[PDB]
Amino acid sequence: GIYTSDRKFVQIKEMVPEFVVPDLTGFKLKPYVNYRAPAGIDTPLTAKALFQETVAPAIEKDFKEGTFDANNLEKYGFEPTQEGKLFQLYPKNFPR
Amino acid sequence: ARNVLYPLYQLGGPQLRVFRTNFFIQLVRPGTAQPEDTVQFRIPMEMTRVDLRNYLEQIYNVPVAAVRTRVQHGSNRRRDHKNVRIKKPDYKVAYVQ
Amino acid sequence: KYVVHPQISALNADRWYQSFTKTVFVSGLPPAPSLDLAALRAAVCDCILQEQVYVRRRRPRSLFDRRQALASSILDQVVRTLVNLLAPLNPVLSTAALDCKRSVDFYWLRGEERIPAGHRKGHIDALRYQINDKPHNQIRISKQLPEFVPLDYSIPTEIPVMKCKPDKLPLFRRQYENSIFTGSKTADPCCYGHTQFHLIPDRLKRERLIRQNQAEQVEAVFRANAIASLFAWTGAQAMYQGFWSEADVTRPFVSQAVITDGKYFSFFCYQLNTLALTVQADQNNPRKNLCWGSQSQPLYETVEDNDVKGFDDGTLLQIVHFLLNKPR
Amino acid sequence: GLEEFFDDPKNWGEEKVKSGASWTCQQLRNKSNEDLHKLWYVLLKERNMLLTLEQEAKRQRLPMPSPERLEKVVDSMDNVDKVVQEREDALRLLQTGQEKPRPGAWRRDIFGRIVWHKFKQWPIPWYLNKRYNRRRFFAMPYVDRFIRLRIEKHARIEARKRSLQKKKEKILHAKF
Amino acid sequence: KFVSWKSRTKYTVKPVKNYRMIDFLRFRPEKEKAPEPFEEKVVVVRYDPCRSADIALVAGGSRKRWIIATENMKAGDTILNSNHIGRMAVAAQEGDAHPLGALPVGTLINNVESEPGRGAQYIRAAGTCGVLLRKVNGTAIIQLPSKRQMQVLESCTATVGRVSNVNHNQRV
Amino acid sequence: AYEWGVRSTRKRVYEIPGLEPITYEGKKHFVPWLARPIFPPWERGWNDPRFHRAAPIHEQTLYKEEPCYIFHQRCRLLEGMKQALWLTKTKLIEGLPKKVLSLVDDPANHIENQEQRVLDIISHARLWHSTEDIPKRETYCPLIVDSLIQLCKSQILKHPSLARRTSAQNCTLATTWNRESLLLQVRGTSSTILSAKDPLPVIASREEVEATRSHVLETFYPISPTIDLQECHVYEVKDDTGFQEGYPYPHPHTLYFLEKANLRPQRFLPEQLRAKMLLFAFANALAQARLLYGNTAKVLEQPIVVQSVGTDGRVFQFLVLQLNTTDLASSEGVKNLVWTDSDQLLYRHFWCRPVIKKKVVVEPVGPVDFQPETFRKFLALYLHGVV
RNA sequence: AACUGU
RNA sequence: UCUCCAGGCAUACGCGUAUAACAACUCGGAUAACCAUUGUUAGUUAAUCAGAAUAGGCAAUAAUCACACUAUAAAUCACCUAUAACUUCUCUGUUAACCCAACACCGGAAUGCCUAAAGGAAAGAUCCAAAAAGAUAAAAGGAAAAGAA
RNA sequence: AACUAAUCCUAGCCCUAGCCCUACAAAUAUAAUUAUACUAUUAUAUAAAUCAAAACAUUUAUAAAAGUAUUGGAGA
C-alpha cells in the first residue's frame, strides 16, 4: 500500500502479491524420488542448446526453401522489445 | 517471496502475482493460553498478515477469521568465546483465528 | 484498565461482553391512540427524500464519508419529526430529553487476576473495564421506564464463561480517569432513559462483513453494542440514585435501544438487576442482568426519484410501540 | 489443509520415515515448464511440513524422524530453481543479449575501487532525481594515497603468505 | 540552524511572532488608487518592542499599515500623503507625508529620505526632528539628527512634526 | 527604508561548430569533470497529483473578463450596514414587523413556565450538557440555539399547522445580481433553513412598496461598493434557495446563522453579523423571485418575505427581509423593505462554576442579567406565519 | 535575663 | 497467620531479554536461604494505543470562568475561486524487579494521578567487656528559655 | 615421590633476493548499507616547525674528478 498525506494508509491492490497456486491433482511428481531410479547427468541448458532445439529447425527448413530474409528475424521468434509481455526478461519485472 | 525485489507498480500496471512463494511458515504450539480456533504460526518477517490469509486460503485452503501478529525481540546477551554477542534470530508469531 | 469499544469486530464478542457484564441475552423482545399509520409512513418517507434528493450541501472532500454522512442526516431528520408526531399521543415524549451524539461512560469491576511477574508478582488485582459510548441519538426522561419483568426473575439460561484471559481476545489495558456518566450530569432533571439510537460504522456493515466472510458476526455486532451500551447507560442511571456495589438496586432498571446499519433496524431491551459485580460484592448474589434483543430488520428498500420504495411499516410500528410506552 | 502441515498420523512416533533420493537437475530439466512449477509447490509443501515437525520436536526436546527428508527436499527445490533459471537465462540472452537480468554497470566508488553498480527502478529520470545525483560515484583526491597502499598491501600479502608457507615447511622438515 | 526571521511575504498590521512590519516609504500608493495624493486615518497609537518610539497605525482606503508616530500623532487623527509638489504652501497636518517642495522653510520634519525613493532611514528615533534650513527650486537642506546638513531633491518625502517622546533627546 | 532580511540569506567546447560536447548523461550521474547535459522534457506517462500543478485561471473556459464580486461568510464589509443596503437596494425600517410582535401577545403562543424552562435550557446548554466544567462557545452556542428551537419544537402540540414546516441542515444559498453595472454575488451555506409549504405573509402593502421609490440608497464615495468582496473572473451564474426544485417546502421561513467562535477577536462584530445576514438573506429571497418570475427585471407584484436570526449564544440578532423588486440594475426606484432588531441580549454573563470568594458564593451557576424577552422575540419569529 | 548536665 | 514500616501506580527517557518455566549448585550476589548466577526452552498479539496535490482571492480589536472591567511584560490555518486525484488497513512499537554513576554504589533521574485499597521489613547467632559514638533521664544550683538592648 | 609450580616447539615473524601492477539474494553515501522522487553535487598554496648552531637571528645534508674549486652569524 501507500501512505498518503494526513498519515492515512491506502492499500493498493496491484502492489499486494497474489499467490498463484497450481493444481497438484494429476501431478505425478512428489518431493522424493526412487533410489531405484538412476540419476541423470547434469546438462545445464544454454542459449546454444535453446536456439538449436527451437529456432534452428525453422531456419533450416526455411533456408532450404529459400524463404529467409533479415527483416523476418521476428518470424523465427526474435522479440524486438520486451514491452507488452507480463514477464520481461530484461529488465526483470516479475518476482520469483 | 522474501529477499527479492518486487516490480515497481505505477498506475495502469498489472496486479502483483507471486507464482512461486519463498515464504516458509511453521505451526507452533501456543506458549500462552489461546482460544481453540486461534493458531500460532512462525512466519518470515517480510510477510504481511494479509499474505498469510491468502497463503493459507490458497495453498492450504484453510479459512481464516481473524489474525493477530507480534514480533519477538531476539536475545543478544549471549556471547561467544571471542566476546562477540550472539543474537537469536528474530521471529514473528501470528495468531490466526 | 481494559478499554472496551461498544462497536468492535472481535469474534464472538457478544459472549465475552456478557461474561464481563453478567448479562443474559434472551432472543426476542421482553415478555409483555390512533395516529394514521399511513400518515407516519409518508412523513418518514419525505424526510429521507429531503436529505438525499432535495437538500443542497457542499460535497465532502474525502469522498469516503459521503455514504456515512448521508445515513446520519436522514436518521436525525426522521427522529426529530417522529417525536413531534408521537408527542401528543405519549406525553412522556414532550417532557423527554433528546441527546445527539453525546458520550455515555460506565466503569465496573468483574473478576480478579494474579500478577504473573514483576515487583508485585503474585499480588491479586481486580479486572478493570471501561466502556465509552456515543450513541447516535438517545432520549432521557425524568421518570424510570416501566419494568418488563419483576426483579429476581430467574431463567434456566446461564451467562457465558470465558476460559481464556480477556487479553487473549484482542483487548488492551490503559490507565486513565474512571468515569461513570448517563449522558448528562446529575444536575440534569432527566436522570432516566427512554431509548437509544446506534449507527454501526461502514467497516462493520453487512456488505463489507460479507466480503470479509464474517457474515455471521452481523448479529454479534448488534448484540455486543446493545449489551455494552445499555448496561453502561443503565448502570450509570442506578448510580445516580445512590445504588452502588455494596448497595444493590432495590428496583429493576430497564431501558431499550435500537441499533441500525443505515437500512436494517434492530431493537434491544435491557434490564439491570445487579450492581454487585466484584468478587466480594458478588460473593453471594443470585440475581443476574437480563437483556432482550430482536433481529435487525430493513426499514425501507431504495430511494428512486422523489419517491422511496419498499418502506416497511412493521419496523416503524415497533418504533411507534416503543415510543408510546410510558411508566404506569 | 492443516493436516498437510503435519506428518502422517501413522508415522508419528516412528524412528524414521522411509524416503527416496532427491530430484536431480537432469530429471527436472526433462520435466516441462508447467511440471516444474507444480513440482516446486509439492517440494515446498513437504518442506513446510517438515519444518513444522522439526520446530515442534525442538520444543518437545525430541529427535526429528528422518531429518534427511528436509535436506532432500531443499536440494530438489534448489535444483528446480536453477533448471528454471537456465531456461530463463538462455532466452534472455537470445532476445536481448544482456548477460544479467537486472540492469547494471561498472562504476567507481568514492574509495577509488571499481565495482558493479546495480541499477534501481525510479519513477523520475536521474537528472530530475536530486537524491540519486546526491549519491557519490566519484573518488576524492585523497584516495591516491590509498591506491598506493592497495598496491603495497597486495605486495605485502604475497610476502606474508610466503612467510606463512615457510613456517608450514618447517613442519615437513621437523616431522621428517 | 540560523534561518532569517524577516521572511514574511505579506505585509500585515497584526503583530508577527511580536514584530509589526513598519513601512518607511511613506507614499506607497495603496490598492485602488493612482499615484496621486491620498489620505489615511491613525487608528491606534501602539507600542513597538523593537523601536524606541511608539508606532501609530495609519490606515486608508483598503490598506492598513504601521508607521512611526510623530510628536502630536494621536488615535483618530487624519494623515495625508501627497506626491504633488505644491505651487503654494500646502496645508500641513503633523504626520502628513509631503514633498520638501510643498513645505515651507522652517517646518519641523521627520522620517526623511536622503535620496528619492530610498525610504525613511533617519530621524526615526524618539524626539528627533529635521529642520528645513533652506529651500530653493527643486533642492532643499534638511538637518539630520547627527547634525549633518544634507541637500536632497524636493521629490524626497518628509513627514511634518517631531517624533514622539519629545524629550527623548534630553534624557539624562 | 530599512532592508529586512539578513544579507547572508539573500540570493568553448560548446561553441565549436559541427560537433556535440560530451556530457555525463551516459554516466546517468553528475560528475564535475564532464559537461552538464541539456535535458529534453521528461514524460511520466501518467498524471501524479502530488506533483501536478493547477492550470492558470485565464486558460479556464469559464474565465470571464467582467469581474464577479462574491460575498461569503468570512467577508467583512468596511462600511458595514451602509454598503449592504446599497448592494441589496433595500430600505430599512427600524424595529420588527408589527405582525411579528403580536404573535407572542397571544396567550396560547406563550409557553408554560417559559422563563423557567429557558433558564433550565441555558443552564443545560452551558453546564449540564457536557461533562466539562466550563464548556466553550464552540460547543454550547450551537446547543443553546437547538435547545431553544427544541422548546419551540414542542409547540407543535398546540399548533398542528406547525407540522407543515421542517428544517434542513447545511443548505446553500446563492444569487447573482447587478447594481449600477457592478456584478455582485452572495454565497452562503451552513446553518439551518426552516421551510414551510406556504409563503410568509407579506409585511408591506403595495402602496408602501411604491412609496419606497422616494428612498435613495446611501453612498460612501470614493470607496467602491465592491470593497471587501472577492473579485472572481472564473464564475457561473447560479441561483440557489438551499433545496432542489420541487422541494415540498419551497418557501423558506427563517435563515439561521451561528457565530460560535470562543474568542472575541475570532467573533465578528454585531454590525458585521447583521450585514452578513442581510446579504445572505437577500440572496435567498432573490433566488425565490427569480425562480418564480424568471430572470426578468421588474418590480415584484407579490413581495417575498424572508426571515433571518443570528446569534453567538449570548447576543441574539433578529432580521426580517421583504423582497419587493427584482429590477436591481438601477439604484433608484422601488426598494426592498427590511426590519432589523439588534443587540438582543439573552444574558449579560454566565458562570459555569460557582464563584466563591472567602467562602461566599458571589456568583451562582446561572445566567447573569437573563432577559426572557430575547426568547420571546425568537419565539415570535418561529410562530409567525402559522398563528 | 531566662534556660538548661556547659 | 502475627509484629511493625509508609511514596505508590502509569507514561517519557534510557536499557535490550536482566523478562517467564524447567534443570543445575561449579562461577556471579561481597554469607546463606533464594536467585539477579550457569544451561535449555518459552515470551510482547492494535483500523480504536503509539510511530512511520496545485494556483489565485482575503484578514485592525489577547487571555484571565471573558461579561463588566481595566491594564502592560503586548498575548490568534480558516474561508472563498479554480485545477488535480477517485473506493483504503499494511508495516513498526508492546517483556522485565530495567536507567546515568567502573559495582545489586545510602548518589542522580521528567510528567500525570492519587496517599495507602498501593508499596514494604530495622533482628546471621551469641555476649552485654572496657574505651568511644548516638539517644533518653537529673536532687540542689542555673553559664560558676524563645524575652531586652 | 609434596602442594603451589615447572617442563616443550612451532604460533608466527625479520632481513635481503626475486617480482611492479592490471585479484549469493538483498541493501547502500538520503540518517551510507532505509527496495521508488525530498536536498543538487566538490579535496588542495613553498610543508613548516621541532631540530643543529650547546641560546638565538641568515643559515641547518635528507664511478671518478672530490669532500677539491667554491659557499656559509667563513659557523653548525
From Swiss-Prot, chain B:
Domain of life: Eukaryota
CC terms in the record's Gene Ontology section: cytosolic ribosome; mitochondrial inner membrane; mitochondrial large ribosomal subunit; mitochondrion
Subcellular localization: Mitochondrion
Gene Ontology molecular function terms on file: structural constituent of ribosome
Keyword terms: Mitochondrion, Ribonucleoprotein, Ribosomal protein
GO terms for biological process, alphabetical: mitochondrial translation; translation
Keyword Plastid on entry: no
Main subcellular location of this protein, as a coarse class: mitochondrion
Positions of disulphide bridges: none
Ribonucleoprotein listed as a keyword: yes
Residue spans crossing the bilayer: none
Sequence similarity: Belongs to the universal ribosomal protein uL23 family.
Quaternary structure, from the entry: Component of the mitochondrial ribosome large subunit (39S) which comprises a 16S rRNA and about 50 distinct proteins.
UniProt-recorded name of the protein: Large ribosomal subunit protein uL23m
Organism: Mus musculus
Boundaries of the shown chain within the full protein: 2 to 98 of 146
Curated annotation (Swiss-Prot), chain C:
UniProt entry tagged with the keyword Ribonucleoprotein: yes
Keywords for the protein's UniProt record, in alphabetical order: Mitochondrion, Ribonucleoprotein, Ribosomal protein
Entry GO terms, CC: mitochondrial inner membrane; mitochondrial large ribosomal subunit; mitochondrion
Keyword Ribosomal protein part of the UniProt annotation: yes
Location within or outside the cell: Mitochondrion
Record GO biological process: mitochondrial translation
GO molecular function, one term: structural constituent of ribosome
Residues that span the membrane, as ranges: none
Family the entry assigns: Belongs to the mitochondrion-specific ribosomal protein mL65 family.
Subunit relationships: Component of the mitochondrial ribosome small subunit (28S) which comprises a 12S rRNA and about 30 distinct proteins.
Full protein name: Large ribosomal subunit protein mL65
Species annotation: Mus musculus (Mouse)
Gene name for this UniProt entry: Mrps30
Coverage span on the entire protein: 90 to 424 of 442
Curated annotation (Swiss-Prot), chain D:
Sections of the chain in a coiled coil: none
A Gene Ontology biological process term: mitochondrial translation
Keyword check for Transcription regulation: no
Family per similarity comment: Belongs to the universal ribosomal protein uL29 family.
GO molecular-function terms, A-Z: structural constituent of ribosome
Organism from which the protein derives: Mus musculus (Mouse)
Assembly and interaction partners: Component of the mitochondrial ribosome large subunit (39S) which comprises a 16S rRNA and about 50 distinct proteins.
Domain of life of the source: Eukaryota
Region of the whole protein represented: 65 to 240 of 252
Compartments reported by the entry: Mitochondrion
GO cellular component: mitochondrial inner membrane; mitochondrial large ribosomal subunit; mitochondrion
Residues with the N6-acetyllysine modification: 82
Feature: compositional bias, Basic residues: 166-176
Keywords carried by this UniProt record: Acetylation, Mitochondrion, Ribonucleoprotein, Ribosomal protein, Transit peptide
Lineage: Eukaryota, Metazoa, Chordata, Craniata, Vertebrata
Protein name per the record: Large ribosomal subunit protein uL29m
Curated annotation (Swiss-Prot), chain E:
Keywords: Mitochondrion, Ribonucleoprotein, Ribosomal protein, Transit peptide
Subunit structure: Component of the mitochondrial ribosome large subunit (39S) which comprises a 16S rRNA and about 50 distinct proteins.
Full protein segment contained here: 62 to 257 of 306
GO cellular component, one term: mitochondrion
Keyword Ribosomal protein annotated: yes
Protein name per its UniProtKB record: Large ribosomal subunit protein uL2m
GO molecular function terms listed in the Swiss-Prot or TrEMBL record: structural constituent of ribosome
Family the entry assigns: Belongs to the universal ribosomal protein uL2 family.
Coiled coil: none
Main location: mitochondrion
